[PDB]
Amino acid sequence: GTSNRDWWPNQLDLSILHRHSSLSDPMGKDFNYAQAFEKLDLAAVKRDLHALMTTSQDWWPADFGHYGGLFIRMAWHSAGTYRTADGRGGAGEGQQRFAPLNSWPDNANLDKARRLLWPIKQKYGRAISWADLLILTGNVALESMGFKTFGFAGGRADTWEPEDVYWGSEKIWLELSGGPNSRYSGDRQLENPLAAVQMGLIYVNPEGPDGNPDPVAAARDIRDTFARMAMNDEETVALIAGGHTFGKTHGAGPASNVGAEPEAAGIEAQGLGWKSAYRTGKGADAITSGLEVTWTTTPTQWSHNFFENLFGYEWELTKSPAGAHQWVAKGADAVIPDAFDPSKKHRPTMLTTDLSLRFDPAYEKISRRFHENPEQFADAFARAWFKLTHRDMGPRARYLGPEVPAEVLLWQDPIPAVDHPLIDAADAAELKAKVLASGLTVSQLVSTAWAAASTFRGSDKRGGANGARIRLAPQKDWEANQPEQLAAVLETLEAIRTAFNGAQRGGKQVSLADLIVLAGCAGVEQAAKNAGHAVTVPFAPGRADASQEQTDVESMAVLEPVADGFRNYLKGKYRVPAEVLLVDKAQLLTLSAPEMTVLLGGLRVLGANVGQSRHGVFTAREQALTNDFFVNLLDMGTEWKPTAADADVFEGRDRATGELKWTGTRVDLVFGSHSQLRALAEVYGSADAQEKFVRDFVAVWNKVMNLDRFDLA
Amino acid sequence: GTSNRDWWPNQLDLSILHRHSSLSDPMGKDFNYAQAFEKLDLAAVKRDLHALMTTSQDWWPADFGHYGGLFIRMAWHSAGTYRTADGRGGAGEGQQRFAPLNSWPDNANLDKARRLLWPIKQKYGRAISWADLLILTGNVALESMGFKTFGFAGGRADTWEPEDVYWGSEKIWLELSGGPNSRYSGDRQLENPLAAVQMGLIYVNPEGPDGNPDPVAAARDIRDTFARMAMNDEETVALIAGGHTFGKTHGAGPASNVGAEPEAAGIEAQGLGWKSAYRTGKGADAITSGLEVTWTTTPTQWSHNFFENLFGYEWELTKSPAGAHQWVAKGADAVIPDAFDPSKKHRPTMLTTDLSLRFDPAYEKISRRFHENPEQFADAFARAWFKLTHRDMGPRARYLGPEVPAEVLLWQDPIPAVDHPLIDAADAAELKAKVLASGLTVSQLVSTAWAAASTFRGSDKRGGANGARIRLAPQKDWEANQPEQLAAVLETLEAIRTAFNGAQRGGKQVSLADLIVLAGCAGVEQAAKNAGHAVTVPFAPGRADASQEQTDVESMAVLEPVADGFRNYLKGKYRVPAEVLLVDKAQLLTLSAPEMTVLLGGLRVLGANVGQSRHGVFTAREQALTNDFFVNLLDMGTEWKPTAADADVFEGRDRATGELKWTGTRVDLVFGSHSQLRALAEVYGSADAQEKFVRDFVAVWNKVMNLDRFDLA
């Protein structure tokens, strides 16, 4: 069945922007998961989960009679695909039940876990999402086994198809580094945006880097991948040691016994995979990773035994029954229970990556401190578990239910509570008037509010104009944001704000976050007036200003646009074509193809480009809101050619005279090239489309201004 | 970027069902093209098109100063992708402007043609679709050159992305037959559903079969492909001779001078392709097919010169300047004009496929009669041209504007006008009650109305319950429709109809078409009552009954379901897995994945299966409308295995006892296997889903019942 991707493997793909359509979703368009969850009896759900922990099913018998370990692993996997580079992955969409993640090798036998949860899912229906239920089950596993969690928030709505995520270019599961599609180069540098060391792993290889069992070099991978999932050294030790306080690994026999992963299994397997020909294929004979390690003397109860063993023994390299590298305690007694036979006992064992916690110098200091102060280990693990499983939930305003922690955490990019009356319609008209009277230009106003709001990404719901972080480090210094021009606009808006607030009664005031956005609104209204159209742009007050102390500068760095097609900005040279980067950014901002088209064509004529570039400014009335970009781009009287100096810059010249009309980038011209985008441009470039263009522009502007406004949701 | 299709190349693909989403469409959700077109000043458009025919642009100079021939070709290609086997292709969605068609080799330089229409598209905007404008332009070309067309209908709404159509398996453009992906086997049998002899051709190879210039054997390909586009011998001769009365072919120099097709061209090409390094690249130097043939002495005017030349000379084989095989009349004077140089003249030339019209014995009789009676040729061509360009438009109710022909054609599957008052709500309630009192069962009622309505296909908008053709040849004898049970139901409904109509005042009466649907509604209402729920299924009267004499039996054959997963029916054994055939049928019925899932799971428990098979009937309350299919399918207490007797049939047995519970096909079990479909089945299989299942089932039942009701559009 030959397809367009077969004939034209390099053409830009837009299907990423029209995922998650009302067509694939079985719930009605009016369904509101937050409202459903809010009515769920969460206490009842958690009782059913407690009971489940020790209700062993014969098709996948519980180790030590308790599923807790397996379910902690399931939840750590649901959350462990997260990358800070784009915010993609993580537990917030329940993607573990779809391709490819349901069939990654590191998710082997988590299909069993998920199926054990079907009876609970089915009982509570739509009032609890799979996404939420995977995390809750992990919380309950912890609690059942004696560990007090820091809290839980509901709110993760299910999704109904796979997201398109770049997980790497390897065409072989688990391919070691240095192949034709290597994710590494240089001195072990992992390519952005990836956060795992091999295709189909969560973070690192439990045997060591590319299979080499060197705990010290494994530490290097752990530190790098975990940092790419937003965890520092303390959170990393806490999570790994916390986790491997419970349960066991499975490697009872050779991996050759294990058959097809779920997406490749026969129809009769009914959604499950990795069927094993080894003995019973399950339970005592289970094969999952190929390792056979049980870390503690009480695998079903919280203890301080992980660090006791790690430091209390010396370790010797050995092989599991499947032939994988692992470690065993020199000269120890057989103190570790067997998962199924009360008459067997085993010596303590560890993974290469567990030993990293001791043989990496920096990890050893932390591990020793946890060993000596197990109350500090327990509290760090509670906190890092909450972070791990909530990191892609977005602002606290999205957190649902009775178990949400009250403590405000730096990682949540907290926004202060609004404690005062908000500006009303009259006040917003008075402020827009003062903004326009100050001398600020349409280009300034629009570029500034674009820079504040366009940081949002819906993958992890970080970013946006709430907070007024544009005035803080590091956003105020980003090159894309034009730090000197920014500084002048913000000075002028800050004087307007001060004077407005100074004149109020009753403690009414306006935040600088709201003013930035309202000012961008004024500039759009002025641009419409410039073109002879009376337009009013919507505006919703209620944003608040975050402090510098509420704004982790290092964590903010991943939000820096290094490509923003909407401002014709490319920070340097990338292997990925600029148009590909545009569609990616559109995806992050949650825009469809039509919204991306309208919004770029308007921004162009409004003077939102970085550095005042003329690239793509296809109008002779800059700062007037018109459909000029589309009419001129599509004019076959103009002929386009890449420049001698730079193949990624084009000159449009009159076809008869030869005279230079315009210049453009690939971002600009792709709208006149790609057959779907050009179809869209043609709608906006038609003679009956001036009003439609303005209206669709103002709608997508307002959508972008409100992307992080979950306080209004 | 490695994707799910790379890892699992054989998994079922659902993305075909969620094409044409509101996300990709730039028009408002309320936009109604029929309304827009109805206010178009069509006469003004056609005046601008007229002018265009002789206004040459320097970037694509008009041959003989007249674009007409190019535009006829453009419109023939727009319409010529149509296959009767599935109704896919055709001009009705303007798909020529999207991949792959915009870049097929047979569409070379039609990108020029489309671009020459942009100024007119732009001028009239949304009130004329590209789809419409391609056909209209070809009409106006014909008219400008003295040919009287049969009519024109507007109403082809634009689409905004490529359809997914199976165009064959070859991975090489224009690959000759007999390769590793050959579309032929046996004695020259072309695989269904294909209707072209090589990948990226419209119908046949102009040089002869696989390039062998034998007119007689070329005739065999023409007749086979044209039949697969719904054209008989008479319509084929007329269309080929008709078309080649105008214009010329382009082969001024070697093919190697021609560059990348549009989808592969650089961004600077701005959507155009086949840039040529041969001399000026255009005009007198144009290279399109590589042939260099001009058929008539007046390439810009209708005439009967095609057959005068074809019969008036003897032909000899020669090569064009690009090396392609074609024919020349050596004994002729140089009577044919040159397209650019008034001082040059050329001998008559023909394609091998033109000579087929003379050397195939059956074609020669028709061609001779056209030759001797060119008024009959003009009429046959006007009629076949209208058919060619309207064949996928659907019911005459969809035809818009002032030029629609009044003559009703057999090929349109015509529906008689309704001349009497319709039944109202009370009447429909009285008829539902009579149907249910007759003894007809929920299974009979639902099966019959499903069989009538489910012939519809949105690809060409043929089929559906309007017309009551289920009672006529050939539908009444299709195996899927269970001819003997059908006959009994229709007898009983016909007695109900007679008695109702006999009792009326004022000429009110009910069609058998309407009654079949209303009866299916009553069966669904009773099934819901059987399950303890009172519902009203919506119902819209207005269908009419067509006669046998208004029903082309041979053309109806392509609508026979040979696979209908919604009735667990497979007429014989196919290479394509049954689940794939299900999704394809869903696509034809215009269903999303959720609607396909609800619909199938209800139909199973209602007793819709062919032959009363138990396969997938996972309920102990058959004929009650419940969500039992999903609850039982998803019960992990049941284990499934393929049977010894048939690998495509499965037994579900109790996992603990081994007792046989159910049997099912691939069609049934895919909903418990495929990760997206199983997520759907889960929503409908949850404990809070009885109401949702019934409501969503009734909504999709109704959707199906109304698929051909463009009279209510």
Ligand code: HEM
């Ligand atoms: C360096 C990071 C990590 C490595 C390389 C790693 C490796 C593994 C492997 C290979 C298994 C065995 C799978 C099997 O054969 O069944 C396992 C099990 C598990 N891991 Fe980790 N792990 C890491 C971090 C984590 C973290 C952050 C957590 C939780 C906070 C976690 C909790 C668990 C649990 C609970 C199990 C046991 C499952 C059961 O009892 O079936 N691990 N780990």
Ligand code: HEM
């Ligand atoms: C056996 C069926 C057919 C074959 C193999 C065929 C083949 C071709 C080829 C090879 C060209 C030259 C393309 C180029 O180099 O520019 C062409 C031109 C054309 N064909 Fe056909 N054709 C077929 C049927 C039709 C039909 C049904 C129509 C319309 C009713 C049509 C109308 C035209 C016209 C108008 C041109 C001239 C283009 C121009 O002047 O620029 N043909 N045909």
Ligand SMILES: [Cl-]
């Ligand atoms: Cl994702």
Ligand SMILES: [Cl-]
């Ligand atoms: Cl199609």
Ligand code: NA
């Ligand atoms: Na994410």
Ligand code: NA
């Ligand atoms: Na079609």
